[PDB]
Design a protein around this ligand. Structure first.
Ligand code: FMN
Ligand code: SF4
Lengths: 129, 432, 62
């Protein structure tokens, strides 16, 4: 139905040599994927709804001039977004970075009722509003 | 058929026979009037019977509520879960113009305690928590010596009137706040916590004081209950009109010759009420500039509507206001309506418990901007901003104090916008 | 004691209103020591007494 001289190719993609990443950056660097935990200073939620990948932090020395934050690894302030973790891990393997996986932690739904603020015998009765 | 006019309530038909302190307010005079008559039979007849006659009489909320007493008291007919069912009676009366509860309680407390006994028998309540505004010290002292006399006579307490219903009354002081008149704020105040209202649901029915099933009531609401129970719902249903039936203890004050509080049949036009009882507004009917109906919470009404409208909840609703607690306050021509509403909303700002944002912030904002209005420092645009702020306050507050403070502003704007405009024009002209 | 027995057991802090008012009845102006004494009498945390002292009218703190 889509005849274009199709060929079964079982082994996974090795686009590594195509990407141009240097050997030690494609080998030594370890990237982890995760859902970023929300800033506890905020109650907003729509920042833990994506799968972001980031790389291990490297040396950060202070230059002699003003004590700036000169670094050497270019892939330090590089974070990639992904809808589902499967896409992220596929990208990681096909690129060739050693990857680490953390499962999407989500808040457990707790039973909440205002009638618990008052009680006849339960300890849950509040003492101030 | 339908009673053509309402007014001149029969003197023997007035429920509060000692409203003016003309009779012995202790047990002897109360029983001479007819208090504590047929109680035994009333408890024996049952909560279902009492609830039937409270529906037949058809009392809308006497404490400025309007909800029928029938279903409100039927909310306490479900089988007891084990928690101690209680009855609560509210007696704050901090509302500008409210003086009837204080008068009845210092003059007819035995009728009140008989309302609590009969009502609580209907309610399935263990006892009554009769809460008294702390400023009314001698009034509480009188009601409780009356209560002690009733206890000595055995009418209230164990086996009340020889019926086995173990009802009781607890006299509760309050360190003073109009917000304590709100039913859930009352629950909170009597719970030893702050007088901040709680959000419903949980309604006061299932969850009340200490979490037990309770139900609030006005002093007048329960005080009229025993007499109408002894007589039957026909007496209350006869007076007044449909829905709004019976009698209400009207309070009259302001710029009237005789600022009195009198009992009168229900749904009576104001034109008769102010002139015949209060000696007319000082300066004649012409001098009357405005009248605020029951409670300052209800918006003020110009004289163009008061002379025709009856004093009944639905008609005042048609009059763009509410019936409230029949605290008719009259302001004459010499009265500065703007400054009067200024002091009124200043009282509201002083009484806000500050729980929810709309009340706590908007009432203060209104106080400042409207005091500027009273002085005259404003642009004609700010009237619309004040109206929109009044709308914002309405409906977004935990309790109804927000609504009761927003409504007077709405009435003032709607009925006296040009007076505001000329005031601010004069303010613009005087300074150059 | 009379104020305490009026209220159901378990919920006894509800009596914090009269007793503290009772303090007024014997002292008028209420020192911070009066609030602490009422708190220790009613087995209620001191600031729960401070809240009702500073939120209602009268209760002259000066
Ligand atoms: C701010 C505020 C103050 C109130 N003050 C009183 C009051 O002083 N007396 C009263 O009977 N009801 C007062 N109420 C109404 C109560 O919340 C409750 O609806 C009423 O006591 C029921 O009376 P009823 O049982 O006669 O219908 C107040 C409500 C609000 C929102
Ligand atoms: S309107 Fe809100 S803030 Fe104001 S007294 Fe009622 S609950 Fe408290």
């Amino acid at each position: 139905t889509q005849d274009t001289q199709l060929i079964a190719v079982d082994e996974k993609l090795d686009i590594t040599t195509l990407t141009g990443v240097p050997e030690e950056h494609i080998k030594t660097r370890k990237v982890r994927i995760f859902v970023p935990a929300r800033n506890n200073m905020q109650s907003g939620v729509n920042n833990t709804k994506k799968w972001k990948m980031e790389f291990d932090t490297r040396e950060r020395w202070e230059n002699p001039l003003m004590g700036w934050s000169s670094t050497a690894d270019p892939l330090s302030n590089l974070v990639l977004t992904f809808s589902t973790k499967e896409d992220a891990v596929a990208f990681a393997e096909k690129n060739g970075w050693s990857f680490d996986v953390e499962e999407r932690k989500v808040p457990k739904p707790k039973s909440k009722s205002y009638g618990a603020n008052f009680s006849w015998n339960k300890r849950t009765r509040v003492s101030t509003k | 058929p339908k009673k053509t006019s309402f007014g001149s309530l029969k003197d023997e038909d007035r429920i509060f026979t000692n409203l003016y302190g003309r009779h012995d307010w202790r047990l002897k005079g109360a029983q001479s009037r007819g208090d504590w008559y047929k109680t035994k039979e009333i408890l024996l007849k049952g909560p279902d019977w009492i609830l039937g006659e409270v529906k037949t009489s058809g009392l809308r909320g006497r404490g400025g509520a309007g909800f029928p007493t029938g279903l409100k008291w039927s909310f306490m007919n479900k089988p007891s879960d084990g928690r101690p069912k209680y009855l609560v009676v509210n007696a704050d009366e901090g509302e500008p113009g409210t003086c009837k509860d204080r008068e009845i309680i210092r003059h007819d407390p035995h009728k009140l305690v008989e309302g609590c006994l009969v009502g609580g028998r209907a309610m399935g309540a263990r006892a009554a928590y009769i809460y008294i505004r702390g400023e009314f010290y001698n009034e509480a002292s009188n009601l409780q010596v009356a209560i002690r006399e009733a206890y000595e006579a055995g009418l209230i307490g164990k086996n009340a009137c020889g019926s086995g219903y173990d009802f009781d009354v607890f006299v509760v002081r309050g360190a003073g706040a109009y917000i304590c008149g709100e039913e859930t704020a009352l629950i909170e105040s009597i719970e030893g916590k702050q007088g901040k209202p709680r959000l419903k649901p949980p309604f006061p029915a299932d969850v009340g004081v200490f979490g037990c099933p309770t139900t609030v009531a006005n002093v007048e609401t329960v005080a009229v209950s025993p007499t109408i129970c002894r007589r039957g719902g026909a007496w209350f249903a006869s007076f007044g009109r449909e829905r709004n039936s019976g009698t209400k203890l009207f309070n009259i004050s302001g710029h009237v010759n005789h600022p009195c509080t009198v009992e009168e049949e229900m749904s009576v036009p104001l034109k008769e009420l102010i002139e015949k009882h209060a000696g007319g507004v000082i300066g004649g009917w012409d001098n009357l500039l405005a009248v605020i109906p029951g409670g300052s919470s209800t918006p003020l009404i110009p004289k163009s509507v008061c002379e025709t409208v009856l004093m009944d909840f639905d008609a005042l609703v048609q009059a763009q206001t509410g019936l409230g607690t029949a605290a008719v306050i009259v302001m004459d021509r010499s009265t500065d309506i703007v400054k009067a509403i200024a002091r009124l909303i200043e009282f509201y700002k002083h009484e806000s418990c500050g729980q929810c944002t709309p009340c706590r912030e908007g009432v203060d904002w209104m106080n400042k901007v409207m005091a500027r209005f009273v002085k005259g420092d404003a642009r004609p645009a700010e009237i619309d901003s004040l109206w929109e702020i009044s709308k914002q306050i309405e409906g977004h507050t935990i309790c109804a104090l927000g609504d009761g403070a927003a409504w007077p502003v709405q009435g003032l704007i709607r009925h006296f916008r040009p007076e505001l405009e000329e005031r601010m024009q004069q303010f613009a002209l005087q300074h150059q | 004691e009379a104020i305490v027995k009026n209220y159901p057991e378990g919920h006894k802090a509800a009596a914090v209103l009269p007793v503290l008012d009772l303090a007024q009845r014997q002292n008028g102006w209420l020192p911070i020591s009066a609030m602490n004494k009422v708190a220790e009498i009613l087995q209620v945390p001191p600031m729960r007494v401070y809240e009702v002292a500073t939120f209602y009218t009268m209760y002259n703190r000066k």
